[PDB]
Each structure stands twice: as C-alpha cells, then as structure tokens.
Symmetry: none
Amino acid sequence: ESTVNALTSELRDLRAQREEAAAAHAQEVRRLQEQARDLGKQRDSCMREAEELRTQLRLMEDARDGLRRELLEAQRKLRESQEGREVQRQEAGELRRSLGEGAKEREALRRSNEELRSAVKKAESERISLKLANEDKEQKLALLEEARTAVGKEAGELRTGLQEVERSRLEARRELQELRRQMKMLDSENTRLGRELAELQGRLALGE
Amino acid sequence: MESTVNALTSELRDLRAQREEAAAAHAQEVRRLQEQARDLGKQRDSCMREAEELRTQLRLMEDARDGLRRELLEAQRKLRESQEGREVQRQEAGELRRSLGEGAKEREALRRSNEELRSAVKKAESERISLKLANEDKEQKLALLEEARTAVGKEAGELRTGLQEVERSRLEARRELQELRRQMKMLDSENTRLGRELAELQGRLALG
C-alpha cells in the first residue's frame, strides 16, 4: 500500500517530466532551425551584393579611367589651339608690317606718278611753243625771200637798162664824131670858095 | 505485494534510463545546431565585412570619377572658347590677306602706269631735240638771208645812182649833137650862099 502508492507517484511524476522535456526540445530545435534559416538567407543575400558591388566598382574604375584619358586629350587640344593662336598673332603682325610698307610704296608711286604727268604737261607746252616759234620763222622766210626776189628783179632789170643807155651813148658819140668830120670838110670847102672870090675880084684889075 | 511492485520498479528503471539517454541526445543535438548557426554567423559576418570594404572603395572611386567629370567640363569650356578666338583671328586674317591682295593689284597697275609715263618723257625729249635743232637752223638761215638782202640793197643803190649819171651824160651828149646839127645848117647855108655869089659874078663877067 504505502510502498506501491509512493512509487506510482514518482512514475506519474517522471512520465510528466518527460512530457515537458520533449516539449522543450521540440521547441528549441524548431527555433534553432529557424535561426539557421534567417542566417542562411542573409548570408546568401550578402553574396548577391558581394558580386553586385564588385561589378559596379569595375565600371566606375573604368569610368574613372575613360575620364583620365579624356581630360589629358582635352588638355592636349587646348595646348594645340593656344600654340596655334600665338602663330596667328605673329602672322597678323607680319601682315600689318607688309600692309604698311605696301601703303608706303603706294605713296612713293602715286607721287612719282604725278611727277611724270607734271613733267608731261610741260613737255607738251614746250612742244607746242617750239613748233609755234618754228612755224613763224618759215612764215618770216618767205617774206624775206620775196624781198630779195623783188630787189633781185629790180637790179636785174636796172642792169639791162644800164646796157641800153650805154648803147645809146655809143651810137650818139659815133654820130657826133662823124658829123664833125663832115663839118670839117665843108669848112674847107667854104674857105675854098672865098678863095675863088678873092682871085676873081682881085686879078680882074690885073688881067685887063 | 511483490509481483506488481517489481513490474512498476521495472518501469521506474526503464524511464529513468530513457530520460538519461534523452537528455544526452537533446544536449548533443542542440550542441550541433548551435555550432551550425555559429559557422553560418561567422560566414555572414565575414561577407558583410568584405561588403563595407567595397562600398568604401566604391564611394572613393565615384568621388574620383566626379572629380574628373567636373574637370573635363572646364577643359571643354576652355577649349571651345579658345577655338572661338582662333576662328575670330582666322576670319580677321582673311580680311587682311584680301586688303593686301587688292593693294598689291593697285601698286602693280600704277607701276605699269609710271613705266609708260617715263616712256612718254623719253620720247618727248627726243622730239624736243629734233625740233630745237630746226629753230637754230631757221635762225641761221634768216641771219644770212638778211646779210644777202642788205648786200643786194647796197648794189641797187650803187647801180641806181650809177644809172642816173649815165643819163646825165646821155642827155648832154644828145643835146650837143642837136645844137651841132644846127651849126651844120649854117655851114650848109653859107655853102649855097657862096655859090650864088660866085655864079652871079661869073654870069656878070660873061656879059661885059
């Protein structure tokens, strides 16, 4: 009685304790299994992002490098255009240098150009005046030429009359000296006649 | 009793031995589960630990990318505004080269013009030499032509005073011959008168 009931109390006691023990462990294994699930999925979520960020890095690292190449080329293009501009400034100074000396040759020539035209307007007035003087000297030459031709005809004819007058003074001298011959004879004839009157009127008283 | 007390004490021995092994299989199983989530926790921690190291380097490369982008934009702005200065200077240079190209045509046309002008003066002095050589000849001519007419004017004056006196001796000669023909009529009268005186005397002396 007191032996069997005291033992049955513990046999119900252990059957109950084992009921609670199997409860507790049926609970932890479910929780602990649920903890490995949360830790299993987070670990797998991190391996997803582990690659995801590693690839997004490489693109940046490349994106960076494409930029470092592109800057260094733009620096290059800018040093080519400024250097290209310094020559443009030189070229300009050289163009204006020749442009001003070109307008300094343009003055020398336009000035010698008027010196020529101002020397051709005297060369023409000196021509027209030397011709005018030389034209008047031939119109003087006829006027002085006829003057000699006129006085040449005068003495030319005046000499011919000189010859006719010497003709007339010769024929007159011949007639004069011839008739003095004739007067001289007739003068002897007159003194002869008066000799015949002297002999007749004289020997008349002597003959008878 | 004894028969039922041993079958129940056999139950006391049976379960106490079973919970002995159940407690042991319960500790070992939570031992392994805990040790599993430990491993899985040490893996997740070591990933997230690598993940923040990447995200750290990510931000750093993005910062370096953004620094290069900022600067390419300044590079770009400086380049395009320099181009605007060399394409302003270029169109400036094409005007300068055009004005010099025009001034070069004008200087060459004038250079041509002076050359024909200097040629006009070359011929103008050639004409002045051939036309002054003509005046000096015309003055030489009309010099000796005046000498000629003054000489011929002297001869006329002599010939003309000469003719006037050979006329005085022509008229004196003709007037002497006329008065000496008058003295002949007196000798011829006295001739016939002597004959009448003589014949009348003879004709008387032949009567008585």
